[PDB]
Amino acid sequence: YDIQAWKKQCEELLNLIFQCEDSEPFRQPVDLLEYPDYRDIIDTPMDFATVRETLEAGNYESPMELCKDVRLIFSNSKAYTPSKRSRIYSMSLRLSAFFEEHISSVLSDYKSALRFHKR
């Protein structure tokens, strides 16, 4: 019932993501010189270094806020891809499945800790 445990769990999950080869296109903001039309399609850029920095700054209040920003990395890739068979989009789908499989227990444990506190 540790209300704060999600933070270290998210740091460790980000470490696993940074080791995945599939995260390489998403570690840093998209290079707007290589993709000059990026901001014509994407309203809010997001990347894993920004997520990690926001977490380490103490600027997430819950793992649900972190999960919203990670999910934005994946929805941006889906919106930007010129094809559902593109290399970088395919990497995003695998990485999203890995993220979702690992974040589920983090969210469940956090919500359980809040409920126990309210009890």
Question: Which 21-40 residues touch ligand UXD, going by CB under 6 A?
Answer: 25, 30, 35
Distance CA(38)–CA(47), nearest Å, equals 14
Distance CA 119, CA 101 (A): 28
46 touching ligand UXD, by CB under 6 A = no
**CB-wise, 18 or 111, nearer to ligand UXD?**
18
- Which range of residues in 14-22, 60-68, 80-88, 93-101 is near ligand UXD by CB under 6 A? 80-88
What DSSP designation does 60 have?
-
> What is the rounded distance in angstroms from the CA atom of residue 79 to the CA atom of residue 12?
28
Rule CB under 6 A: say whether 80 interacts with ligand UXD.
yes
**Binding region for ligand UXD (CB under 6 A) out of 10-18, 73-81, 98-106, 109-117:** 73-81
Q: Quick check: 80 and 42 in contact, CB under 8 A?
A: yes
Burial code (b: 16+ CB inside 10 Å, e: under 16) for 52-61 equals beebeeeebe
The window from 3-11, 56-64, 79-87, 98-106 that contacts ligand UXD (CB under 6 A) reads 79-87
Q: How far is the CB of 87 from ligand UXD (least distance, A)?
A: 7
CA distance 109 to 27: 27
User: Which residues lie near ligand UXD (CB under 6 A)?
Assistant: 25, 30, 35, 77, 80-81, 86, 88-89
